[PDB]
Amino acid sequence: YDIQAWKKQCEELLNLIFQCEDSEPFRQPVDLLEYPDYRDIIDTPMDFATVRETLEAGNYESPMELCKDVRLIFSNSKAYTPSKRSRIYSMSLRLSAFFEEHISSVLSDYKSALRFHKR
Numbered sequence: 443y444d445i446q447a448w449k450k451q452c453e454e455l456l457n458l459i460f461q462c463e464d465s466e467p468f469r470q471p472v473d474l475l476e477y478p479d480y481r482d483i484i485d486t487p488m489d490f491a492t493v494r495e496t497l498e499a500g501n502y503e504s505p506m507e508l509c510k511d512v513r514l515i516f517s518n519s520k521a522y523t524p525s526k527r528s529r530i531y532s533m534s535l536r537l538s539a540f541f542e543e544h545i546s547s548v549l550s551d552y553k554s555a556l557r558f559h560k561r
């Protein structure tokens with residue numbers, strides 16, 4: 443019932459995501475020089491370095507907030523892709539499946555810890 447355990451669990455999951463080749467297009471903000479119309483479609487850019495920095499600065503209160511930012515990386519990729527068959531979008535789908543498979547226990551354990559704290 444450790445209410446703080448999610449933070450190191452998220453740090454370790456972000457480390458795995460950074461080791462994965464599929465994360466390369468998402469490790470840093472999208473390059474506006476390569477994609478000059480990016481901000482005409484995407485209102486809120488997000489990337490894994492920003493997620494990691496926000497976590498390390500102590501600026502997430504819960505793993506749900508981290509999960510909302512990670513999911514924004516994937517929805518941005520889906521909204522900017524010109525095709526559902528594109529390379530970068532295809533990498534986003536595999537990364538998303540891996541992230542969701544691993545974040546599920548983090549969220550469940552945190553929510554269970556909070557419910558126990560308030561019993």
Ligand SMILES: N#Cc1cc(Br)ccc1O
Pocket residue numbers: 458459460462464465533536537538540541
């Ligand atoms: N992150 C990540 C990831 C992990 C495995 Br296993 C396979 C594909 C991926 O995109």
